[PDB]
Amino acid sequence: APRSVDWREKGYVTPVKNQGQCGSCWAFSATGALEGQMFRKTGRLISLSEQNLVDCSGPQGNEGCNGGLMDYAFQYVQDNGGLDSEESYPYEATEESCKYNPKYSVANDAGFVDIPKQEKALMKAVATVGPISVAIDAGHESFLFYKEGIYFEPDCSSEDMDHGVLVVGYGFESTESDNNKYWLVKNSWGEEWGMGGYVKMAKDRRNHCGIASAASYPTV
Numbered sequence: 553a554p555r556s557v558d559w560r561e562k563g564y565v566t567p568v569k570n571q572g573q574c575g576s577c578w579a580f581s582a583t584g585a586l587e588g589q590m591f592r593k594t595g596r597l598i599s600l601s602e603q604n605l606v607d608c609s610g611p612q613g614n615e616g617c618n619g620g621l622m623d624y625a626f627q628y629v630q631d632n633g634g635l636d637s638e639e640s641y642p643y644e645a646t647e648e649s650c651k652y653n654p655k656y657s658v659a660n661d662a663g664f665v666d667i668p669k670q671e672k673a674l675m676k677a678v679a680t681v682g683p684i685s686v687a688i689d690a691g692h693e694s695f696l697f698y699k700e701g702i703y704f705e706p707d708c709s710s711e712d713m714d715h716g717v718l719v720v721g722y723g724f725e726s727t728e729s730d731n732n733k734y735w736l737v738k739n740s741w742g743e744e745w746g747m748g749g750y751v752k753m754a755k756d757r758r759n760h761c762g763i764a765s766a767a768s769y770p771t772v
């Protein structure tokens with residue numbers, strides 16, 4: 553595979569969003585991956601509605617601000633026959649009744665693909681598909697305060713993931729410890745967190761924080 557990938561340079565990625573005080577990370581991860589695959593198909597990048605997913609994908613297993621999964625969101629888009637744009641169905645950071653309107657649907661999918669639980673497989677997917685939805689263990693103060701560099705948390709779990717994010721690429725940079733590889737990850741905590749809303753997470757370090765343990769993307 554390539555040694556470095558960044559889908560932002562190819563037009564696949566919307567600006568960083570902010571989920572607010574609502575456990576809807578799974579919906580931001582899902583819209584990020586679908587934004588990328590829709591752009592791959594149509595050449596048009598359109599921001600998609602996380603609120604549509606929060607309010608409407610309960611029947612697929614999601615629980616609004618109380619948690620969810622990207623695959624359940626991809627299934628909703630397929631079952632429902634569409635997903636509204638961000639502009640038409642804006643984000644409110646609280647669960648409400650479903651207000652989906654098919655007239656304003658701008659995305660579709662025909663299912664999804666789950667990636668094997670190996671960083672080598674995640675790398676192949678990122679290199680060939682586009683941005684990939686992943687789940688990570690983000691439950692450490694070091695993640696809240698991250699500013700720059702490669703994030704490595706010795707107490708991170710590869711089995712207890714609690715936060716959905718989007719891998720938009722990978723790369724390397726020289727470091728003190730010579731652990732130089734990273735996943736380029738888009739978060740949904742606004743642009744004031746991290747590096748403009750992004751984090752470089754340790755790559756090829758025993759599946760650090762579980763980044764390869766629940767990776768998937770929608771089929772468009």
Ligand SMILES: *[C@@H](O)[C@H](Cc1c[nH]c2ccccc12)NC(=O)[C@@H](NS(=O)(=O)c1cccc2ccccc12)[C@@H](C)CC
Pocket residue numbers: 574575576577578613614615617618619620621622686687688713714715716717
């Ligand atoms: C991210 O904003 C969100 C925060 C959140 C809300 N509730 C919980 C409970 C445990 C951990 C994290 C939580 N995280 C998630 O949605 C996660 N999904 S989950 O599989 O841990 C999950 C937790 C609670 C309820 C439900 C309901 C349906 C499906 C899943 C869950 C992460 C892993 C998303 C990638």
